[PDB]
Write an enzyme that holds these catalytic residues in place. Structure first.
Site, PDB file in Angstrom:
ATOM      1  N   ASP A   9     -40.047 -76.630  75.484  1.00 39.23           N
ATOM      2  CA  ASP A   9     -39.225 -76.027  74.446  1.00 39.23           C
ATOM      3  C   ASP A   9     -39.197 -74.574  74.890  1.00 39.23           C
ATOM      4  OD1 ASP A   9     -37.646 -75.328  72.291  1.00 39.23           O
ATOM      5  OD2 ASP A   9     -39.335 -75.035  70.892  1.00 39.23           O
ATOM      6  N   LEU A  10     -38.241 -73.804  74.398  1.00 36.83           N
ATOM      7  CA  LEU A  10     -38.139 -72.412  74.803  1.00 36.83           C
ATOM      8  C   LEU A  10     -39.074 -71.515  73.966  1.00 36.83           C
ATOM      9  CD1 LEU A  10     -36.689 -70.258  76.602  1.00 36.83           C
ATOM     10  CD2 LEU A  10     -34.924 -70.182  74.812  1.00 36.83           C
ATOM     11  N   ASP A  11     -38.709 -71.282  72.705  1.00 37.31           N
ATOM     12  CA  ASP A  11     -39.503 -70.437  71.788  1.00 37.31           C
ATOM     13  C   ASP A  11     -40.976 -70.858  71.653  1.00 37.31           C
ATOM     14  OD1 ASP A  11     -40.252 -68.607  69.787  1.00 37.31           O
ATOM     15  OD2 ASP A  11     -39.434 -69.916  68.181  1.00 37.31           O
ATOM     16  N   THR A  17     -39.107 -66.046  70.883  1.00 43.67           N
ATOM     17  CA  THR A  17     -37.783 -65.703  70.355  1.00 43.67           C
ATOM     18  C   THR A  17     -37.717 -65.795  68.821  1.00 43.67           C
ATOM     19  OG1 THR A  17     -37.126 -67.990  70.462  1.00 43.67           O
ATOM     20  CG2 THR A  17     -36.704 -66.624  72.418  1.00 43.67           C
ATOM     21  N   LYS A  45     -37.572 -72.281  62.475  1.00 43.90           N
ATOM     22  CA  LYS A  45     -38.059 -72.248  63.841  1.00 43.90           C
ATOM     23  C   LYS A  45     -37.672 -73.498  64.609  1.00 43.90           C
ATOM     24  CE  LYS A  45     -42.362 -71.750  66.444  1.00 43.90           C
ATOM     25  NZ  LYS A  45     -41.917 -70.594  67.276  1.00 43.90           N
ATOM     26  N   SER A 116     -34.271 -77.093  74.147  1.00 43.30           N
ATOM     27  CA  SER A 116     -34.236 -76.081  73.107  1.00 43.30           C
ATOM     28  C   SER A 116     -33.017 -76.306  72.229  1.00 43.30           C
ATOM     29  CB  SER A 116     -34.195 -74.692  73.786  1.00 43.30           C
ATOM     30  OG  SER A 116     -33.977 -73.646  72.866  1.00 43.30           O
ATOM     31  N   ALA A 117     -33.117 -75.969  70.941  1.00 46.06           N
ATOM     32  CA  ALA A 117     -32.002 -76.157  69.980  1.00 46.06           C
ATOM     33  C   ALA A 117     -31.028 -74.981  69.971  1.00 46.06           C
ATOM     34  CB  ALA A 117     -32.542 -76.370  68.573  1.00 46.06           C
ATOM     35  N   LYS A 147     -34.662 -81.413  65.548  1.00 44.73           N
ATOM     36  CA  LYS A 147     -36.040 -81.862  65.517  1.00 44.73           C
ATOM     37  C   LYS A 147     -36.294 -81.969  64.020  1.00 44.73           C
ATOM     38  CE  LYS A 147     -37.036 -78.477  69.261  1.00 44.73           C
ATOM     39  NZ  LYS A 147     -37.604 -77.067  69.348  1.00 44.73           N
ATOM     40  N   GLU A 171     -44.598 -78.028  73.324  1.00 44.00           N
ATOM     41  CA  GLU A 171     -44.024 -77.408  72.131  1.00 44.00           C
ATOM     42  C   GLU A 171     -45.077 -76.675  71.271  1.00 44.00           C
ATOM     43  OE1 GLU A 171     -41.901 -76.092  70.627  1.00 44.00           O
ATOM     44  OE2 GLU A 171     -40.428 -77.583  69.880  1.00 44.00           O
ATOM     45  N   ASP A 172     -44.627 -75.769  70.392  1.00 42.62           N
ATOM     46  CA  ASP A 172     -45.536 -75.004  69.509  1.00 42.62           C
ATOM     47  C   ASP A 172     -45.316 -75.233  68.004  1.00 42.62           C
ATOM     48  OD1 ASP A 172     -43.147 -73.593  69.019  1.00 42.62           O
ATOM     49  OD2 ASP A 172     -44.132 -71.645  68.909  1.00 42.62           O
TER      50      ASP A 172
HETATM   51 NA    NA Z   1     -41.127 -74.086  70.037  1.00 38.63          NA
END
Ligand code: NA
Ligand code: NA
Length: 225
Positions: A9-11, A17, A45, A116-117, A147, A171-172
């Protein structure tokens, strides 16, 4: 039982971000009598732009009071402001341990994907300077389900042409972890253990994402799956 890919995932995994989105959403939200806080935002998020906007309006019982055109206008203003903030991101903003992981995955002849979304994911990877490390980038613009729906993660598996059962998703946020498990992949959570309890593996921070450790844990999971 070899790994076919790592899907990130990006963030909160590649870079942070979430605060930038929050600053951008907060400004637009104030204009409609809604003041979101870093607690509520924690449910925006990893959510796509228009869905994120609907949830903000929902919070003030005005989700259905605006036309989508007007929502399109509001989203644009927010996007422009968000893009202005992320245009200051550089390689120094890559979360600790990620570059080293990206290299090792590649040396073990394993594909790398981003799920990423955000339709701004490409712009962000180019500022970080690592877009070349990614074999496939799922286009959020074609994803019809946020998600915890597993769509965005299945899209990278399709894109890379690999079996999800042999993929590792990192992922976070709990929604992302649910999406990863729902895509039948090995889920790796980064952050608080209690919030990421459904992950197959949870580490404290991106510095704990070491390739040999991830692989040893992956093999364990596969044997017991
Ligand atoms: Na994330
Ligand atoms: Na899983």
């Amino acid at each position: 039982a070899m790994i076919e890919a790592f899907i990130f995932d990006l963030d909160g995994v590649i870079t942070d971000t979430a605060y930038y989105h929050y600053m951008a959403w907060r400004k637009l939200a104030h204009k409609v009598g809604i003041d979101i806080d870093t607690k509520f935002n924690e449910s925006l998020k990893g959510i796509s732009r228009m869905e994120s906007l609907d949830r903000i309006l929902e919070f003030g019982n005005k989700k259905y009071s605006f036309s989508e055109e007007e929502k399109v206008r509001m989203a644009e203003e927010k996007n422009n402001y968000y893009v202005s903030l992320i245009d200051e991101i550089t390689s120094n903003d890559i979360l600790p341990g990620i570059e080293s992981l990206l290299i090792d995955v590649k040396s073990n002849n394993i594909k790398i994907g981003l799920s990423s979304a955000s339709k701004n994911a490409i712009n962000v990877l180019n500022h970080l300077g690592i877009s070349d490390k990614f074999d496939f980038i799922a286009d959020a613009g074609k994803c019809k389900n946020n998600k915890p729906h597993p769509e965005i993660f299945l899209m990278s598996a399709k894109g890379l042409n690999v079996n999800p059962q042999n993929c590792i998703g990192i992922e976070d946020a709990s929604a992302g972890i649910d999406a990863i498990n729902s895509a039948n992949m090995f889920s790796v959570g980064v952050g608080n253990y209690e919030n990421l309890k459904k992950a197959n593996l949870v580490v404290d921070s991106t510095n704990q994402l070491k390739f040999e450790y991830i692989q040893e844990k992956y093999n364990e999971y596969i044997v017991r799956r």
